[PDB]
Design a binder for these strands. Structure first.
Ligand SMILES: [Mg+2]
Ligand SMILES: [Mg+2]
Ligand SMILES: [Mg+2]
Ligand SMILES: [Mg+2]
Ligand SMILES: [Mg+2]
Ligand SMILES: [Mg+2]
Ligand SMILES: [Mg+2]
Ligand SMILES: [Mg+2]
Ligand SMILES: [Mg+2]
Ligand SMILES: [Mg+2]
Ligand SMILES: [Mg+2]
Ligand SMILES: [Mg+2]
Ligand SMILES: [Mg+2]
Ligand SMILES: [Mg+2]
Ligand SMILES: [Mg+2]
Ligand SMILES: [Mg+2]
Ligand SMILES: [Mg+2]
Ligand SMILES: [Mg+2]
Ligand SMILES: [Mg+2]
Ligand SMILES: [Mg+2]
Ligand SMILES: [Mg+2]
Ligand SMILES: [Mg+2]
Ligand SMILES: [Mg+2]
Ligand SMILES: [Mg+2]
Ligand SMILES: [Mg+2]
Ligand SMILES: [Mg+2]
Ligand SMILES: [Mg+2]
Ligand SMILES: [Mg+2]
Ligand SMILES: [Mg+2]
Ligand SMILES: [Mg+2]
Ligand SMILES: [Mg+2]
Ligand SMILES: [Mg+2]
Ligand SMILES: [Mg+2]
Ligand SMILES: [Mg+2]
Ligand SMILES: [Mg+2]
Ligand SMILES: [Mg+2]
Ligand SMILES: [Mg+2]
Ligand SMILES: [Mg+2]
Ligand SMILES: [Mg+2]
Ligand SMILES: [Mg+2]
Ligand SMILES: [Mg+2]
Ligand SMILES: [Mg+2]
Ligand SMILES: [Mg+2]
Ligand SMILES: [Mg+2]
Ligand SMILES: [Mg+2]
Ligand SMILES: [Mg+2]
Ligand SMILES: [Mg+2]
Ligand SMILES: [Mg+2]
Ligand SMILES: [Mg+2]
Ligand SMILES: [Mg+2]
Ligand SMILES: [Mg+2]
Ligand SMILES: [Mg+2]
Ligand SMILES: [Mg+2]
Ligand SMILES: [Mg+2]
Ligand SMILES: [Mg+2]
Ligand SMILES: [Mg+2]
Ligand SMILES: [Mg+2]
Ligand SMILES: [Mg+2]
Ligand SMILES: [Mg+2]
Ligand SMILES: [Mg+2]
Ligand SMILES: [Mg+2]
Ligand SMILES: [Mg+2]
Ligand SMILES: [Mg+2]
Ligand SMILES: [Mg+2]
Ligand SMILES: [Mg+2]
Ligand SMILES: [Mg+2]
Ligand SMILES: [Mg+2]
Ligand SMILES: [Mg+2]
Ligand SMILES: [Mg+2]
Ligand SMILES: [Mg+2]
Ligand SMILES: [Mg+2]
Ligand SMILES: [Mg+2]
Ligand SMILES: [Mg+2]
Ligand SMILES: [Mg+2]
Ligand SMILES: [Mg+2]
Ligand SMILES: [Mg+2]
Ligand SMILES: [Mg+2]
Ligand SMILES: [Mg+2]
Ligand SMILES: [Mg+2]
Ligand SMILES: [Mg+2]
Ligand SMILES: [Mg+2]
Ligand SMILES: [Mg+2]
Lengths: 92, 61, 246
RNA sequence: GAGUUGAAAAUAAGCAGAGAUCCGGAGAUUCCCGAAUAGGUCAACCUUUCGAACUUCUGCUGAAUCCAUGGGCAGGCAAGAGACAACCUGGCGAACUGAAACAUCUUAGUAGCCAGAGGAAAAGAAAGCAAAAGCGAUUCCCGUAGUAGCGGCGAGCGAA
RNA sequence: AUCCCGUGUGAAUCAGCAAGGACCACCUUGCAAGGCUAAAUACUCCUGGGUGACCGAUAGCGAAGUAGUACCGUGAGGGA
RNA sequence: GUGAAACUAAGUGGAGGUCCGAACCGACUGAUGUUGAAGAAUCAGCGGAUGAGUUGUGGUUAGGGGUGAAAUGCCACUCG
RNA sequence: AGUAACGCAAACAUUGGUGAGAAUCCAAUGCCCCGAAAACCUAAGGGUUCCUCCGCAAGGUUCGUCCACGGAGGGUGAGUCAGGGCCUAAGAUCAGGCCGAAAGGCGUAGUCGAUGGACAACAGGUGAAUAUUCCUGUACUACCCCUUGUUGGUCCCGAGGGACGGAGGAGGCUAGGUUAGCCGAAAGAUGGUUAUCGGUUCAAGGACGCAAGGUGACCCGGGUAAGAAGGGGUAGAGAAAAUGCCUCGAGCCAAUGUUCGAGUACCAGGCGCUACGGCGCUGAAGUAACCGAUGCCAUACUCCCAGGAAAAGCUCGAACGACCUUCAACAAAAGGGUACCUGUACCCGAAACCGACACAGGUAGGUAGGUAGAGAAUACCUAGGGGCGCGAGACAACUCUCUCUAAGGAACUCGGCAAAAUAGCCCCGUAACUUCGGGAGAAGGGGUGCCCCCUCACAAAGGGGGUCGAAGUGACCAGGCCCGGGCGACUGUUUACCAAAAACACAGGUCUCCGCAAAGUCGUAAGACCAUGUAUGGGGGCUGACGCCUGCC
RNA sequence: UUACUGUUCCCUGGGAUUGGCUUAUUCUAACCUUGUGUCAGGACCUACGGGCCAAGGGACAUUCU
């Protein structure tokens, strides 16, 4: 019942990434890029996106940068579309 | 195939050096607790040079 | 097989401090520890011999025992033993080799080994290869006997012991052909003090092959090396001694 | 009491005589390591039953063993821990040096190490000084005095 | 002598005990073997105010700039 | 072969601090270098190379000391 | 002093382009080097050096338009890889407990602690920089749900198992390699010629199963009664286990292999496009024999003495004790669903680690091609990576690194220092001495190429004949030997950085101490080592194989 | 080192720890040693250890002065 750690769930997602490679990844993989907290997990991020936008998450992959900042690859299920969700935010 | 006489630092792993010169090693004995007292009054930035965490980019494994 | 284990005191010669007390110990081949039964408890049950195994932790062989209750034990190997012989530990046991019983029920002039000095500690004396202790006489409280060193000690009567002589008597006959066989046992090279420097041994200095140059030969710690008897005067076991070895 | 959102301009948006910014008093929050104290650990991390560990306090239960002891359970923003330049108290306790050497002696009960505690500490309310006359706890300064003395009667040490 | 300890022995209660530089006698003084106690006194990592026959960038705190930084050392530590 | 053994001829077997010789570990001679490319190396030969072998990783022994197949040698280019 | 040097003697050269500017940057062609690496991964370590754009102050031992430099931005994707969430060794800590001026020391269970054990994935593709991590396809592990059944389970506890050495060689396979065949393409201006060039490939995993291999009692092929692997039953303190007894059982062991995975996927080549990047279609054949591992079966077997970790996971099972419960728990097949933390960049036989340097150095482990060859030596090459970060001329002495040198051959010299010579394989022949093992490759001589035949090639070797050269192990590679003496027996160890020895050690021999609460050793003490050993053992002194001896006071 | 002065290991005596009956020997109760003997908590201690009961020594020795 307990999570791994305890902190602000609304801080798990700071902001997305806007790069020519990231935008290229949305159309090919149906994925999304998000900078995340260092203390975050794949479970909290999976639960997070399920609540904000109301969409299913096929898989989550993460990594820690050299600067101590964690990044999160989020692949949505094929039923939904990351490009459609992208336009809802404002970024293409 | 013989190393020169001055090679005293053979690039040993940081895991073993922390077990010999790390923060936890100093706080065990009374002398190490006084060692840090000298380096704090000195005002040194890095109190223990030979130390590393158990995880992260610094982890030896 | 379950009596063998690898839990031993590694770091031979080194004490808790980690300094060398018993010198010239190190190297050598690895060896597991065998659990030998010296108390010889579980009395009044027959057990036969099946194997005659090699024990690296001693000079003598051992013998596996199989009792009717399924238990298994190790014991020393007597001299004329053969596979199938039985052994018993008790009081009214017949006086033959391999059996164990107190000294009260033994006759005079018996070949005895695996003697215990106190009840419960188990046998301590006459364990080595070809060892034997001859029972001379008994008188009331205690019983005197002879040891392999030739000394006549006075042991209590209620102490247990095993009959016969220990196996593999012919082990001195082979000479270690070379130095490598010595290092395999875990015995490092012995250096002579007369070759050392004066700071290391009292015999050290002097050009050429120096003589002793001292009133007597001395240990590395100053005391003499010949003649001085090291037995503690007024020892607790001083009355149990009948004579000195020879 | 009129302009402001640090150093630190610029940019983008705000607050403000319905009295901001700013200045004081009392409070709140105060992530991780660290006495670190849920457990572990290569300090700032990990695993977690999610817990101030242990000693003390308040209760309940009551091994060998009758009373007890030791354990066990629970309660309790729950007393203590650690840090702290020097001075102070206690414990251990040098050597070079001086004596034109050196051991008695001196350097010195100094240095340094350990422990503890306070704004001061320690000492302290006569089984005391004194000498035929008298003083009336302890501490500090002047002076007695480099005097009386101590000392291989040497170096030097030194009162009341 | 006075004061304080280890070992071993071991008193007396005001008709008494200790001290007064071995000790005895007389006299004087004092009442051990329980404890607490402010002030005058010593110190400055610091705080506020004030003053310098103190320095003025090789000086003055090691350091008037991201100074115990850079750099060196396994480390203690040294150190612009 | 003998009374039985001792002894003895072949074959099998593949022992050894065995032999030659790379890696690996060592460092005997000479040259070169000697403000060196290098605070002990390069080049040409040399020794051991199934053993008392070599080596990694993780550890132990700390100075009136430790360690030493013992040179007063080694113990962070530092050791009477 | 504008002096020495600019870090190996693997080697550069031309054309064209970029640009203010080119021996130094980019591309092309040719030449040359490494190729048990100077190649590709990878551990530690370093800590953004990795990629793109811009720039050239400083840094680079020259130049510089370039860079491991500077500035800006970007980059490391895991249920299966590695580590942790599991276990434990060495060793470090240690509840209580013992000891001790203080600090603290000793120490029991317990807990930490990989260099080990345990545990589930491959191929292909994508590509500014990452992928066993993303995409495709095919699998695996754990948990949950679902469907029946069972209906007491889960810990503690007991037992099994895990569980282990070295050396040696044989056998059965595969990787890999070569050749042949098949397919496709080719005229490479020469005397001739296709005899030339290229391709001929694919995993984890699932399912099946094996000898003429190894093993398993019975005979000189057959017969026969116990007997292997692997099971069952029974008695006693007695569930399992162990021990004893009885009984079934000719088959077992596993690398390899068959099939699916495995598609016209991959692929030579061909057809068209171009900004020349690759894109888009097309895409044949995809077999066999020989050689053969240092790798697999394999802790398979044999022999030997020095006698070759622990714990957990896993499996079996009673009682006592503890916790929980009629599913809410255990257990079986299919199907479906779900899926923690950290590392992942780049260099790594190095210009990025360690050596103060972009230093002729040191740095564990993995992969191991072709010709000759015993070979991972050596020589030349493939894949792939490089031409060594100052150069151009000139061609004095002198120095260093190398080659040859007439006649003589150690006359040199402290000294045959150094150099030269010897060298392989197959035959012949091998002394004194000896501890009978050796000496010994003793020494010293002969042969060695290529072609044909004998010959059946019998894998060889041998014989006969013929032929070329001054020279046939023609290169690289690759022992110099003999006589005598001193010391030490021998293999080995030693003054890291002037001494490798006659010194040390050594097997053996001798003396003396120690009866276990041992002597001895370290500690203030508790205690530890000696030793989980017991006088055929342990400590200490001297001597130093073996042989003859070891006197007198 | 058979230089001077000292320290330590070790040996020996007096005293304490320390007692009883006999003519120095014995006795057991202090003290020393041992137990895979036994009991013990939620559980284990066959993991040191603790309590109990035994065994061997015995007023010696260890320890302090
Ligand atoms: Mg990850
Ligand atoms: Mg090496
Ligand atoms: Mg010498
Ligand atoms: Mg001496
Ligand atoms: Mg001498
Ligand atoms: Mg002489
Ligand atoms: Mg904690
Ligand atoms: Mg802690
Ligand atoms: Mg408090
Ligand atoms: Mg404190
Ligand atoms: Mg002095
Ligand atoms: Mg003097
Ligand atoms: Mg003087
Ligand atoms: Mg204070
Ligand atoms: Mg005040
Ligand atoms: Mg005051
Ligand atoms: Mg006070
Ligand atoms: Mg007071
Ligand atoms: Mg007095
Ligand atoms: Mg007087
Ligand atoms: Mg008085
Ligand atoms: Mg200054
Ligand atoms: Mg000026
Ligand atoms: Mg050899
Ligand atoms: Mg060789
Ligand atoms: Mg050497
Ligand atoms: Mg060489
Ligand atoms: Mg060689
Ligand atoms: Mg040779
Ligand atoms: Mg040799
Ligand atoms: Mg130390
Ligand atoms: Mg010192
Ligand atoms: Mg040195
Ligand atoms: Mg000149
Ligand atoms: Mg010149
Ligand atoms: Mg130079
Ligand atoms: Mg020049
Ligand atoms: Mg070459
Ligand atoms: Mg780059
Ligand atoms: Mg420039
Ligand atoms: Mg330049
Ligand atoms: Mg850059
Ligand atoms: Mg794994
Ligand atoms: Mg404690
Ligand atoms: Mg322990
Ligand atoms: Mg553990
Ligand atoms: Mg590991
Ligand atoms: Mg794991
Ligand atoms: Mg890459
Ligand atoms: Mg087993
Ligand atoms: Mg032609
Ligand atoms: Mg049964
Ligand atoms: Mg990667
Ligand atoms: Mg990579
Ligand atoms: Mg390497
Ligand atoms: Mg290199
Ligand atoms: Mg250097
Ligand atoms: Mg090859
Ligand atoms: Mg080669
Ligand atoms: Mg080549
Ligand atoms: Mg060049
Ligand atoms: Mg270079
Ligand atoms: Mg160069
Ligand atoms: Mg000539
Ligand atoms: Mg001459
Ligand atoms: Mg001459
Ligand atoms: Mg020569
Ligand atoms: Mg030559
Ligand atoms: Mg020959
Ligand atoms: Mg000869
Ligand atoms: Mg040669
Ligand atoms: Mg001569
Ligand atoms: Mg020799
Ligand atoms: Mg040699
Ligand atoms: Mg040398
Ligand atoms: Mg040599
Ligand atoms: Mg030399
Ligand atoms: Mg030597
Ligand atoms: Mg002892
Ligand atoms: Mg000798
Ligand atoms: Mg008991
Ligand atoms: Mg017990």
């Amino acid at each position: 019942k307990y999570p791994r750690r305890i902190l602000d769930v609304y801080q798990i997602l700071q902001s997305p990434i806007i790069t020519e490679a990231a935008i290229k990844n949305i159309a090919d993989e149906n994925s999304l890029l998000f900078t995340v907290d260092v203390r975050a997990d794949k479970k909290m991020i999976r639960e997070a996106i399920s609540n904000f936008f109301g969409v299913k998450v096929r898989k989550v992959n993460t990594l820690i940068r050299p600067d101590g900042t964690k990044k999160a690859y989020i692949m949505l299920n094929k039923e939904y579309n990351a490009s459609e969700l992208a336009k809802k935010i404002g970024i293409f | 195939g013989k190393a020169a006489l001055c090679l005293t630092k053979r690039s040993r792993s940081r895991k073993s050096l922390a077990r010999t010169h790390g923060f936890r090693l100093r706080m065990s004995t009374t002398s190490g607790r006084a060692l840090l007292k000298r380096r704090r009054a000195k005002g040194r930035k890095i109190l223990c040079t030979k130390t590393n965490p158990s995880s992260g980019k610094r982890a030896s494994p | 097989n379950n009596l063998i284990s690898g839990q031993r005191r590694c770091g031979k010669g080194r004490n808790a401090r980690g300094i060398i007390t018993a010198r010239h110990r190190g190297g050598g081949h690895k060896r597991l520890y065998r659990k030998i039964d010296f108390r010889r408890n579980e009395k009044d049950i027959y057990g036969k011999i099946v194997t005659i195994e090699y024990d690296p932790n001693r000079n003598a062989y051992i013998c596996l025992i199989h009792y009717g209750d399924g238990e298994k034990r190790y014991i020393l190997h007597p001299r004329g033993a053969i596979i199938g012989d039985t052994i018993v530990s008790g009081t009214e046991v017949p006086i033959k080799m391999g059996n164990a019983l107190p000294l009260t029920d033994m006759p005079l002039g018996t070949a005895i080994h695996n003697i215990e000095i106190t009840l419960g500690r188990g046998g301590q004396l006459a364990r080595a290869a070809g060892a034997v202790a001859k029972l001379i006489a008994k008188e009331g409280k205690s019983a005197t006997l002879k040891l392999p060193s030739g000394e006549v000690r006075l042991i209590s009567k209620n102490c247990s012991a095993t009959v016969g002589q220990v196996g593999n008597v012919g082990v001195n006959q082979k000479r270690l052909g070379r130095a490598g066989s010595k290092r395999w046992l875990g015995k490092r090279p012995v250096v002579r003090g007369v070759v050392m420097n004066p700071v290391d041994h009292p015999h050290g200095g002097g050009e050429g092959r120096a003589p002793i140059g001292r009133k007597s030969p001395t240990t590395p710690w100053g005391y003499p090396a010949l003649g001085r008897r090291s037995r503690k005067r007024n020892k607790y076991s001083d009355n149990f001694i009948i004579r000195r070895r020879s």
